[PDB]
Write a protein that binds this ligand. Structure first.
Ligand SMILES: [Ca+2]
Ligand SMILES: [Mg+2]
Lengths: 213, 183
């Protein structure tokens, strides 16, 4: 009972079915080219290694088709025609679906490493480039007293490209984590027991302010 | 707060979503991976949710009579004759009733009793649950099915429920006993 998660089940089914179909097809082409055509008394034959067949089938799966290697037996060529009809659809659907699965993993995971003498503040609720930039422009403003408070944003979203930029420009003192204050494990990741305060921001322009409150 | 309170008010809350049980109480040590039945508010009888009922489907298959037992208790006595009368749509018909049907006013009820005072207090003073069980059944026909014990034995009014303790299980004078009784 080791594949406990539907995406991870799908990953292993994709990879193993793809690899086993590629390996078995390479073995079949290796048999056909090295044995030669039976109706030509096996005289028409071409001594490929298994590894040359394996390479050639990837080069045709992907539709690259260098033609540095190619099939020349009639059974080889008829197998390559059948392979092209089947395996272009396999490769062209496998590569996107693996890119989705490996693209799904969370970027801003992990936990706040509390320094030996810095206060920190946890900030959550409505987190966006607008709310964060107006917040940080005042909270870190040069006319305030010099105090080394760190800001820790906790929010469910992946930050947008403008907000990722702003987080990098403040890298020394602003940190961001994927999560929600609704989960005690996320409250521990940001070490909220050791924070000065939690600040909860609101979407002032929402459809329903009773729902937002 | 109340003038001559607060956390001493007895509460039970139905929850539409089981994982919200973590917000229902403090001094609690919440964990979202724990299933509802292990949580402190459920163990104290402060929470309820429909998900704990789902194995009534499987128990309804394996022993029909056990589903009728629970019903006669939880409904207080809604027999299929009442369900038929309600299915006529005329509302719940009633009036003054004959001594022949009124005999059924001696149903058995689930009750709760305290070991703090009265004849059973001798067992609350450091006796064992099996001594209490045999005594109460013999003298009173009171059949004991569990305990309701304070969690903070050393603070809060919270209590937890202990279904069917061992024969040698120690009693506390503050325990309350779940019982089946006729009066
Ligand atoms: Ca709690
Ligand atoms: Mg830091």
């Amino acid at each position: 009972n080791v594949l406990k998660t539907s995406t991870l089940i799908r990953l292993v089914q994709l990879v193993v079915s793809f690899v086993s179909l590629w390996l078995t097809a390479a073995g079949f082409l290796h048999l056909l080219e090295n044995s030669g055509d039976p109706f030509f008394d096996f005289g028409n034959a071409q001594h490929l290694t298994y590894w040359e067949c394996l390479y050639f089938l990837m080069v045709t799966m992907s539709t690259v088709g260098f033609g540095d290697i190619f099939a020349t037996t009639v059974l080889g060529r008829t197998f390559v025609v059948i392979f092209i009809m089947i395996f272009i659809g396999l490769f062209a659907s496998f590569i996107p679906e693996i890119a989705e699965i490996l693209g799904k993993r969370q970027k801003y995971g992990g936990s706040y490493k509390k320094e030996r003498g810095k206060r920190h503040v946890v900030v959550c609720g409505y987190i966006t480039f607008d709310s964060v930039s107006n917040f940080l422009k005042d909270f870190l403003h040069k006319d305030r007293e010099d105090v080394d408070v760190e800001i820790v944003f906790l929010h469910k979203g992946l930050p947008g490209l403008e907000l990722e930029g702003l987080l990098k420009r403040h890298f020394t003192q602003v940190e961001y984590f994927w999560g929600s204050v609704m989960d005690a494990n996320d409250l521990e990741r940001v070490k909220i027991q050791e924070a000065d305060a939690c600040l909860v921001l609101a979407n002032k322009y929402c459809q329903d302010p009773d729902q937002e409150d | 707060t109340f003038d001559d309170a607060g956390a001493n008010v007895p509460l039970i809350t139905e929850l539409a979503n089981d994982s919200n049980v973590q917000f229902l109480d403090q001094d609690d040590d919440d964990d979202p991976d724990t299933e509802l039945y292990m949580t402190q508010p459920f163990a104290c009888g402060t929470a309820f949710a429909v998900s704990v009922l789902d194995s009534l489907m499987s128990t309804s298959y394996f022993n029909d009579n056990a589903l009728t037992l629970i019903r006669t208790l939880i409904t207080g006595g809604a027999t299929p004759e009442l369900e038929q009368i309600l299915a006529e749509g005329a509302g719940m018909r009633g009036g003054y009733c004959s001594p022949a049907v009124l005999a059924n006013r001696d149903r058995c009820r689930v009750a709760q009793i305290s070991l703090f005072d009265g004849p059973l207090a001798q067992f609350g003073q450091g006796g064992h649950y099996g001594e209490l069980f045999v005594y109460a059944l013999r003298h009173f026909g009171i059949l004991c099915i569990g305990l309701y014990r304070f969690r903070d034995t050393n603070p809060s009014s919270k209590r937890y429920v202990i279904t069917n303790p061992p024969e040698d299980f120690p009693l506390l004078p503050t325990d309350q006993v779940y019982v089946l009784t006729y009066k």
